[PDB]
Design a protein around this ligand. Sequence first.
Ligand SMILES: CC(=O)N[C@@H]1[C@@H](O)[C@H](O[C@@H]2O[C@H](CO)[C@@H](O)[C@H](O)[C@@H]2O)[C@@H](CO)O[C@H]1O
Ligand SMILES: *[C@@H]1O[C@H](CO)[C@@H](O)[C@H](O)[C@H]1NC(C)=O
Length: 246
Amino acid sequence: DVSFRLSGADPSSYGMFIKDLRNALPHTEKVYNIPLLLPSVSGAGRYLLMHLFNYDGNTITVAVDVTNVYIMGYLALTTSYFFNEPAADLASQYVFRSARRKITLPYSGNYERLQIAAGKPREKIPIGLPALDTAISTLLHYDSTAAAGALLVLIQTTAEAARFKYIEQQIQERAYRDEVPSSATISLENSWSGLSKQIQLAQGNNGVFRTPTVLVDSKGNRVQITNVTSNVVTSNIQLLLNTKNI
Ligand SMILES: CC(=O)N[C@@H]1[C@@H](O)[C@H](O[C@@H]2O[C@H](CO)[C@@H](O)[C@H](O)[C@@H]2O)[C@@H](CO)O[C@H]1O
Ligand SMILES: *[C@@H]1O[C@H](CO)[C@@H](O)[C@H](O)[C@H]1NC(C)=O
């Protein structure tokens, strides 16, 4: 399992959590020095449990699929909650079985569905460590509209930061003040599967992407990624989604 406490948290302790979360995901191979997530993991071993604690010390446990870093559901007190999707229903056969009750959320876990439920796109929802404290608090008692926004914060400040060094740094900059994600952050989230695929196809193709990935950069300018020498590949992406799952 991995853990993070918002009480006393700083950029340093958040960076330790994100390192722990990365190191908890199994791999047997690296591709261009980046860990390649497993094609599949059978049984309960396919779920990592993240124990998150709000500033007041209350906690939820989040279940993460180790092959794709997708959050499946979470436990809050004696109630489990799962996204309305087959992967999550399958996860509910393995995790938080001891919960008194299981609620299926009224939406799947994809960004588009969550944004619909929350009533706003990611671009307008501030993220940061204070926003993560709020999200944990919100998830502690069921409210499916408030939970959608909370989950958009939770996904970005955990899974997306594990996947991209730049996003981890963006959250560290928001340790004590929330701010909506940069356009580059949104860009990277949206391109993770694409990037992971192109880096894996570059093996067999002399480090060259079969198809170029379009991204927005730090200064807000729109760049094209064509090969593994790009900073996105050498210094940013930390985990690769297996092409078997793409
Ligand atoms: C990173 C994380 O924990 N969660 C989200 C994913 O939920 C989401 O994936 C989508 O949701 C499900 C698979 O979980 C599926 O119904 C969709 O087709 C889609 O793949 C993803 C993109 O919205 O964002 C991740 O970060
Ligand atoms: C690889 O990407 C770099 C930019 O990071 C670019 O300058 C170079 O021309 C590209 N080469 C190929 C073969 O794509």
